[PDB]
Amino acid sequence: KYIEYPVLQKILIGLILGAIVGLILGHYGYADAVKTYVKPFGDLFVRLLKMLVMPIVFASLVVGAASISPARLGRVGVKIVVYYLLTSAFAVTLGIIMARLFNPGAGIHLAVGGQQFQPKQAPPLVKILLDIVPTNPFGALANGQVLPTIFFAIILGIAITYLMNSENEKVRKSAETLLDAINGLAEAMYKIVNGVMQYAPIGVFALIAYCMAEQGVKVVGELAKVTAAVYVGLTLQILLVYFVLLKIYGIDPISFIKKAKDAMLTAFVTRSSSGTLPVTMRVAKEMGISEGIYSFTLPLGATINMDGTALYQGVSTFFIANALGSHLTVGQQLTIVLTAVLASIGTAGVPGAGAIMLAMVLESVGLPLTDPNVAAAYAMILCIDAILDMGRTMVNVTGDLTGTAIVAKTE
Amino acid sequence: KYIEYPVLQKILIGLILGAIVGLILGHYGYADAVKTYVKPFGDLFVRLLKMLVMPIVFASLVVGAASISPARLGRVGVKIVVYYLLTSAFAVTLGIIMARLFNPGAGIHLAVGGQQFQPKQAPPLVKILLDIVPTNPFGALANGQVLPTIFFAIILGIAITYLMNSENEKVRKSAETLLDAINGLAEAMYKIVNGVMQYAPIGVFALIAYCMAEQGVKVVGELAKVTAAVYVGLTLQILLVYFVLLKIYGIDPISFIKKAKDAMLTAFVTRSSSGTLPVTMRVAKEMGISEGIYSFTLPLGATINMDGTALYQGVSTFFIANALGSHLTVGQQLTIVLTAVLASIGTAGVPGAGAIMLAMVLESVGLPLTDPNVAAAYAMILCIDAILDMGRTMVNVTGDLTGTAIVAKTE
Amino acid sequence: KYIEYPVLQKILIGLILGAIVGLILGHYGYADAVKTYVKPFGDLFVRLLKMLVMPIVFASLVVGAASISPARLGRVGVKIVVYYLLTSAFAVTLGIIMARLFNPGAGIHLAVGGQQFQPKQAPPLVKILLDIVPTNPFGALANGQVLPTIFFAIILGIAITYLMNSENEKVRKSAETLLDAINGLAEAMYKIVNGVMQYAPIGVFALIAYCMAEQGVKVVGELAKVTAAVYVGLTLQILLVYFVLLKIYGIDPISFIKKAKDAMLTAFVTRSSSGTLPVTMRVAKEMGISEGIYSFTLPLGATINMDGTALYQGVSTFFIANALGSHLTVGQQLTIVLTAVLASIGTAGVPGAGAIMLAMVLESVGLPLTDPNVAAAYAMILCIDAILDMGRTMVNVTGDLTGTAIVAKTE
Ligand SMILES: N[C@@H](CC(=O)O)C(=O)O
Ligand SMILES: N[C@@H](CC(=O)O)C(=O)O
Ligand SMILES: N[C@@H](CC(=O)O)C(=O)O
Ligand SMILES: [Hg+2]
Ligand SMILES: [Hg+2]
Ligand SMILES: [Hg+2]
Ligand code: NA
Ligand code: NA
Ligand code: NA
Ligand code: NA
Ligand code: NA
Ligand code: NA
C-alpha cells in the first residue's frame, strides 16, 4: 500500500479531487454511478466512525469523570477544573450564537428517500429527566441509549475515585484495576480512530464526490458557511474569553500569543492536542510558569477542556438540524450546551475524535444517526472535518495554556 | 446542601413527615397533587436502585461464588461455609413460616391502572430448568434475565478460582486480573448505593407520602404487620438456631449474647455488617476465639452469610405477592429459599443493599419490577426498609460470631 | 458422584451404550420415550456449549489477534506466524476437498418439525461487506452477530498491542490491564469447557441415543463417513504438507516422525495440545532444535495454529449443510476457509474447544444454531466429537513441531 503521505495532505487532496470528480460526473448526469460505486467507500468510512461511538462514550466519560471527581482534586485541581468547565461551556454557547446568526445548513434541506425528517414527540419533562437513569446499564449500553450511558459512566468514574480513597488496600487495588481496564479500552478505541483516519482520505473523497454529484454546488457554499461560523467562533473564543481573562489577571495577551505561537501552530497542523503537549509544556516553561503547576494542568487539559471541539460540536449540531429542516428548540439548545461540554471532555485529542463525539451530542438532542436524513447531514460535515479540526485543535491547546497561566498567577 | 445529619435519623424524619403530609393531603383530597409533584422524587429513588440491580447481581455473585469455591476452602473454610449456608437457608425458610402465619400484604391488594397483576403461565419444568442456562451471557445480562445471569456469574467465579490454582504464572495473573476488576465494579456499584442512600430520606418521604395519600391508613397497619413478622422471625432465628447450636457446642448462649452485645448493637445502629467487623472481631477476641480463625471467618461472614437479609427477603417477597394478590406456589417458595440465600450472599453489608438484592428474588420468582403492580408493592417496602435493615444487620453479624465460635470450638 | 474414570473412556462408553440403547428402543418403537426423557440431557449438553460460544469468540480472538499483531512479531515471529497461517489455510481447504469428494451428511436430510431448512437470501456483496463492521460492538456482542464480533475483537487485539508499544508508562499499563482481563475471561470460559466436558459422557449418551432412536441406523454409516473424510484429510495434511515442507528444508520426515512419536501420541490421547506442550518441547529438544527458538514457537502454536481443528471445522461444516440439504456455494466455501482459520486460532487446545468454535463458522456461513435443523445436525457431530478430536489434536501439535523445525533450520 505504501501509503506514506502526511494524512492532512492526503485528506485535502481527496477532498479537492472528490469535489471535482463529483461535480463533473453530476453535471454530465452520472450521480447514480457515484451513488452505487463511489459512495459505499464513504459509507464504510462513516460506519467505522459510528462503530467506535458507543465504546468511546462509555469509557472516555468514565475516565473523564474520574480525572474531574472531587475526591481527586487539590486546591489547584479545583481551580483549573472550574476554569476548564466554564470556558468549555462558554465556548459551546458562543458556538450556538455563531450558528444562529449564521444559518449553516439551511437551504440544503433534503429528504433522502422522499421522506422528510420528523422529530418524535418529546415525553413529559418528568419522564425525560427520569429516563436518563437506566434500569439496566448493560441494556442502555447494548442498544444506543446515549444519555443513560452518559449517566452511568459519569457515576462509575466518580465512584471509582472514592474507592481509590479507601483505607483498605484491596479495595483501592480492585478499583484501580477496573479503571485501568476501562482506560485502555478507551485508548484502544482511539487507536482504531487513528487507523480509520488512515482510510479517511478515501472516505472523504467518496463522501464529497457523492455530496457533489447530487445537491449540486450549493453544498460548497454551505460547507464554507459552516467553516466561517466555526472559525469566527474560534477567534471570538480567543479574543472575547482568553484575551479578556488574561488581561483581568495581569497578563498581556499579545506577548502571551507570541509565546504560545509554537504550541498554537503545532496544534493547528498536527491536529492533535496530545501530540502537541511536549511543545505546549515547553512553551509554558518558556513563559515562566512554575514546573509543579503546568506539569499537572497542561496534561489534564490535553484531554479535558477542548473549547474548540465544544464550539465545533455546537455549531455542527445546528447545521445538522438546519439541513434536516428541524428547529432546535430552547432546552434542546441547552441540552447541546451540556452534552457538547461532556462530548468535548470525552474527545481524545486525536485528529478524528471530535467528529465521533459529535454523534453523542446529535443522539442526545434527538437526531439519531440511524435516520437517513441525519446520517446524510452527518456525512456532509465529515467531508470537511479536517478543515475545522485544525483551528479546533489550536483553540483546545490555547485554552490549556491560558488557564495554566491564570491559575499559576493565583496559586 | 450541607446535609450532615445521621442518615438513619434523616430517613426516620422523612418517613414520619411523609406519613403525616400524605395523610392530611389525602384526607383533604389532594392525592393527585401528591401523585404529580411528590411521587416523582420517590420514582427517582427507586429508579436509582433498580439501576444498580443488574451490575450488582452479576459482580457480587462472581465474587461471592469465588470466596465459596471448593478450590479455595481449607478444612476450616469448608466448616464455616457449610454453617453459613445452612443458617442462611434455615433463615429464609423461617421467614416463609413467619410470612405465612402472618399474612402481610393481604388487604392492600390494588391494581394500579385498573388491571390486576396476572402471573404468566410457567413453562414445562424441563424448559424452566434448561432456561437457567443462557445461550448468550452478554444477552441475558443486557436484558434482565436474572436467573441466567445468576448461573453464569456463579460459574465464572468458580472457574476463576480453579485458574488461580494453576501451575502457570500468567494464567493465575490473568484470572486474578479479571476477578480484581469484577470485584471493584461490585465495590463501585455499592458506593453508588451509599450515594443513593444519601438521597433516601427524600425518596422515602415521597414514597410514603404517596402511599399515604392513596391507600388510606391501612398501609400503616400492614407495614407494621410486615415489621412484626420480620422481627419475630429474626428473634426466632436467634433463639431457635443460634442459641440451640451454641448450647449443642457447649457455649452458654446468655454469656455469648452479653459478649456480643457491643457488636450486635453497633450493627443494629450503623446498619452495616462491614462497618461493624472491627467491633465484631474485637468481640471475638474478647470471648477467647483464636486469632487465626476469627480473622478469617468473620471478614468472610461480613459479606457472605446474612441470615437476617435472607429472612427479610423471604418475608418481603411474600408481602409483594400478597399485595399483588397472587399465591406463591410451592416451588416458587423453594425458589425463594434458593434465590434469597443467593441474594443474601450477594448483598454487601451496606445499609441499602438488602432491598436492592431483594429485586433479584422478586425477578426470579416471576414478579418483574417493570410491572406496575410489582413496582408499587416494591416501593411500599422501601418506605420502611431502614426499620427492617437495623435488626436485619444485627442478625447478620450475630450469625458470624456464632459460627466463628462454633467452628473454633471444633477446629 | 465419585466420577473418576478417564473422560475419554467415559465418553466412549456413553457413546457405545447410547447407540445400543437408542437402536433397541427405536426398533421396539419407543423413540418418543427417548425424545421426552433421554434427549433433554443431551439438550442440556448442547446448551452449555452454545452458552460459551459468544464470550469465547470475542475474548479468544482479542487474545489471538494480539499474539499475531505485527506490533509484536520479531523476524522469527513473522516466520512462524506466516507458516502457521498458511498451514491452517491449506488445512481447511484440504478439508473442503475431502468433504467434497466424500459427501458426508447427504442422505441424513431431515426436517425436524416438518419444515425443511431454507437459507435466507444473501444481501448484495456491498452490504455483507459493510455489515461486518458493527455500529454498536456492545449490540453485536449482545445478540449473536458473530462476524461483527470477529471484526471488533480482531481490531481490539491489534490496537492493544500498539498501545503496548507506546512510550508512556500508564498507556502500556492500561492496555495491558485490559488485555490481562480479556485473557482470563477467555481462560475462565475454557475452564467451563473442562467442566461441561465432565458432563459430556452423559450428554453424548443422550445425543446418540436420540439420534439412534430416530434416523434409524444410517447415521452410524454417515457418522463413520465423516470420521473417514476427516482422518484421511488429517493424514493428507501430514503427508502432503508436513512431509513435503520438511523434505524441502532438508529434514528427513521419517526420522522426524520417529522423534515426534511421543508428543504425537500424547496429544492423540490427552486431546489437549496445551497439556502436551511439555512433551512437545522435550521432543523439540531431543531433535536438536535451539532452546531460544522452540521455547517461543511451540507455546505460541499450542493455542494458535490448529491445522487439524481447521480441517475438522471445514469438513464438519459441509456435513451440517449436506444434512440440512443446502449446497454450500462458492464464496460460502471461502468464507469457511477464512472463518475456520480464525476459529482454529480461537480454539484453546482443550478437548471440547474445537466443536464450540465450529459454531462460529456455522454462524458466519449462514447456518444459525437457533434453527432446529442446524441444531440437530450440530448435535449429530457432537456425538462423535471425541473420535475426531483425538486425531485433530495430534495434527495440531505435529504442525507446531514441523514449523518450529523449519524456522529453526532457517533462523
Ligand atoms: N483534534 C482535537 C480533538 C478533536 O476535536 O478531535 C485535538 O487534538 O484537540
Ligand atoms: N445492612 C445489611 C445488609 C443489607 O441487608 O442491606 C448488613 O450490613 O449486613
Ligand atoms: N483438542 C484440540 C483443540 C480442539 O479442536 O478442541 C487441541 O488440543 O489442539
Ligand atoms: Hg459533503
Ligand atoms: Hg409505602
Ligand atoms: Hg448423533
Ligand atoms: Na476531550
Ligand atoms: Na486541549
Ligand atoms: Na454478615
Ligand atoms: Na451478602
Ligand atoms: Na496446536
Ligand atoms: Na486455536
Side-chain angles (χ1 to χ4, degrees), chain A residues 190 273 301-306 309 341-349 396:
Chain A
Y190 277 121
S273 56
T303 47
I304 310 162
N305 179 74
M306 294 173 172
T309 300
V341 166
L342 267 53
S344 73
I345 292 177
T347 300
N396 293 356

Side-chain angles (χ1 to χ4, degrees), chain A residues 49-50 52-54 56-58 60-61 88 91-93 95-96 99 117 128 144-150 190 306-321 324 326 328-329 331-347 353-370 374 378 381 392:
Chain A
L49 267 68
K50 59 177 56 179
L52 313 186
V53 76
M54 271 314 299
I56 288 181
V57 159
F58 169 66
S60 70
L61 287 167
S88 297
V92 54
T93 56
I96 310 302
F117 174 77
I128 183 64
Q145 283 185 227
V146 173
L147 281 182
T149 296
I150 315 303
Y190 277 121
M306 294 173 172
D307 302 339
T309 300
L311 184 142
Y312 154 79
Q313 282 159 351
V315 173
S316 294
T317 300
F318 262 82
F319 168 92
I320 304 292
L324 266 45
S326 75
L328 295 172
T329 70
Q332 271 181 63
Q333 285 179 101
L334 71 86
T335 311
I336 288 171
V337 166
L338 174 53
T339 45
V341 166
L342 267 53
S344 73
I345 292 177
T347 300
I356 297 172
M357 289 303 291
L358 163 62
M360 168 179 124
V361 179
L362 291 176
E363 284 292 345
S364 52
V365 169
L367 310 180
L369 264 73
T370 64
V374 181
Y378 181 72
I381 277 172
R392 205 203 302 166

Side-chain angles (χ1 to χ4, degrees), chain A residues 80-120 122-348:
Chain A
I80 199 69
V81 165
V82 165
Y83 170 94
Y84 285 167
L85 292 192
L86 294 186
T87 52
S88 297
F90 197 89
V92 54
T93 56
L94 191 146
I96 310 302
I97 294 166
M98 295 333 275
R100 278 187 65 180
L101 68 84
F102 291 89
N103 274 321
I108 297 301
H109 56 292
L110 197 73
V112 291
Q115 205 56 240
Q116 183 179 348
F117 174 77
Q118 64 161 357
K120 295 203 170 180
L125 177 54
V126 165
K127 300 306 294 171
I128 183 64
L129 287 177
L130 269 71
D131 288 333
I132 74 164
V133 176
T135 40
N136 185 354
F138 297 113
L141 199 59
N143 53 257
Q145 283 185 227
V146 173
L147 281 182
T149 296
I150 315 303
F151 184 76
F152 178 78
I154 292 179
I155 284 187
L156 180 66
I158 294 173
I160 287 160
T161 60
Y162 280 77
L163 284 173
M164 291 188 321
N165 283 1
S166 98
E167 298 284 14
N168 186 325
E169 153 53 16
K170 189 194 176 181
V171 171
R172 282 193 312 282
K173 181 66 182 180
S174 302
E176 281 151 29
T177 314
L178 172 68
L179 184 48
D180 219 13
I182 295 170
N183 185 22
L185 188 142
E187 287 171 0
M189 306 316 300
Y190 277 121
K191 291 305 289 189
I192 310 161
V193 173
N194 294 317
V196 174
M197 282 303 295
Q198 197 59 211
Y199 175 60
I202 297 181
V204 167
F205 169 89
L207 281 184
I208 199 67
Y210 178 73
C211 193
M212 284 309 137
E214 286 135 347
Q215 299 289 106
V217 187
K218 64 180 184 295
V219 167
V220 182
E222 273 288 319
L223 287 185
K225 191 178 188 316
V226 185
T227 318
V230 172
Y231 267 92
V232 298
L234 295 191
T235 58
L236 270 172
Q237 173 78 359
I238 291 189
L239 298 193
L240 193 143
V241 182
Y242 300 158
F243 271 42
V244 163
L245 269 60
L246 279 170
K247 192 162 191 181
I248 287 164
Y249 279 79
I251 299 167
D252 173 32
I254 301 307
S255 65
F256 177 91
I257 291 306
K258 193 48 202 310
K259 294 286 183 188
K261 156 187 169 64
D262 285 331
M264 286 194 300
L265 264 74
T266 311
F268 180 87
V269 182
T270 61
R271 303 174 306 121
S272 80
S273 56
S274 52
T276 302
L277 179 67
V279 180
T280 315
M281 282 199 287
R282 194 210 69 204
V283 164
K285 191 171 188 167
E286 282 174 4
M287 55 185 286
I289 305 172
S290 90
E291 162 66 9
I293 287 175
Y294 75 80
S295 84
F296 156 70
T297 59
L298 286 187
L300 189 70
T303 47
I304 310 162
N305 179 74
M306 294 173 172
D307 302 339
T309 300
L311 184 142
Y312 154 79
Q313 282 159 351
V315 173
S316 294
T317 300
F318 262 82
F319 168 92
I320 304 292
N322 291 348
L324 266 45
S326 75
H327 293 228
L328 295 172
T329 70
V330 58
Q332 271 181 63
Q333 285 179 101
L334 71 86
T335 311
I336 288 171
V337 166
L338 174 53
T339 45
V341 166
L342 267 53
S344 73
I345 292 177
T347 300

